[PDB]
Amino acid sequence: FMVSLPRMVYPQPKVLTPCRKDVLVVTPWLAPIVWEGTFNIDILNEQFRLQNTTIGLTVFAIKKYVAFLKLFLETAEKHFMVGHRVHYYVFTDQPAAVPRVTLGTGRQLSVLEVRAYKRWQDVSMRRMEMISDFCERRFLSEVDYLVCVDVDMEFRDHVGVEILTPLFGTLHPSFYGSSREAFTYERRPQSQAYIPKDEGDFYYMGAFFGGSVQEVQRLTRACHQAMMVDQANGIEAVWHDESHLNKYLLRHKPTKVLSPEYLWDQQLLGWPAVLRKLRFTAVP
Numbered sequence: 001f002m003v004s005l006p007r008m009v010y011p012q013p014k015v016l017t018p019c020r021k022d023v024l025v026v027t028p029w030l031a032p033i034v035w036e037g038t039f040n041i042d043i044l045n046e047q048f049r050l051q052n053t054t055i056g057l058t059v060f061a062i063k064k065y066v067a068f069l070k071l072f073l074e075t076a077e078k079h080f081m082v083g084h085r086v087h088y089y090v091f092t093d094q095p096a097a098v099p100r101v102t103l104g105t106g107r108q109l110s111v112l113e114v115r116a117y118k119r120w121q122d123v124s125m126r127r128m129e130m131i132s133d134f135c136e137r138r139f140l141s142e143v144d145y146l147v148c149v150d151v152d153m154e155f156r157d158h159v160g161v162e163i164l165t166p167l168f169g170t171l172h173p174s175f176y177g178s179s180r181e182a183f184t185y186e187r188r189p190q191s192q193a194y195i196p197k198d199e200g201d202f203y204y205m206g207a208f209f210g211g212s213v214q215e216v217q218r219l220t221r222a223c224h225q226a227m228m229v230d231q232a233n234g235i236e237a238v239w240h241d242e243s244h245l246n247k248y249l250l251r252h253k254p255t256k257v258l259s260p261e262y263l264w265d266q267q268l269l270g271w272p273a274v275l276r277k278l279r280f281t282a283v284p
Helices: 042-050 064-080 120-134 136-142 211-233 241-251
Strands: 054-061 084-094 107-113 145-150 152-153 167-170 209-211 257-258 280-282
Touching: 054 064, 054 120, 054 136, 064 084, 064 152, 120 145, 120 211, 120 241, 136 211, 136 280, 145 211, 167 211, 167 241, 209 211, 211 241
Parallel strands: 054 084, 054 145, 084 107, 167 257
Antiparallel strands: 145 209, 152 280, 167 209
């Protein structure tokens, strides 16, 4: 049950003037594609705060990648879901190397130890396995949404409830303008991740996906199972769990798609006019 929104004063949406004319803002299956100028964050914040929404953020920091946690967390504190309840789950092989980052009210961090695996095969499947296989009951009890991101990143601008939806992927910054035949999907029919040259909507990046706990567990379970089949069949998808994520999102359409504002690499790609904000970016 959802209470009424309060009275709010904001500019009237104008039916005969689009918010953005330079980009696709809705997919053919009627999922919003989230760009600056498409949303009023005040309305969305009201809608989600009224539900007392809790967002879980999962991040893996293994070996040398623990060095990225301090900037990742400090910038998440400035830009990610501010005003909402947030639970960070940091999965690491080095609990002692996790920095003590000061958190705002209503925000908490849990350090979760991984997990052995000397064989690279199991390391490849570790994230999908851990989100689905081992963390299932924990996430269902603690958060409403799960967001899965890479650690070698920093927040530079607002990333908030505009992304929340049953299931989302993010347009990979190297491919948003590419033809589907150029997408680096897995192309060998022997792989469960296989996508033919005449299929595909978008190329989604493994570095930022999420949705409701239920939908994220479905996605991660399916990808983990598919990866196990590939391993038994002696094949590793060209881009590992990202290849599987792409296959899954082809066959299970996401209910929102994030624009490359949400996963950008300024060193590699600069700052094109189409991006009004650079929100979450690769650390050089």
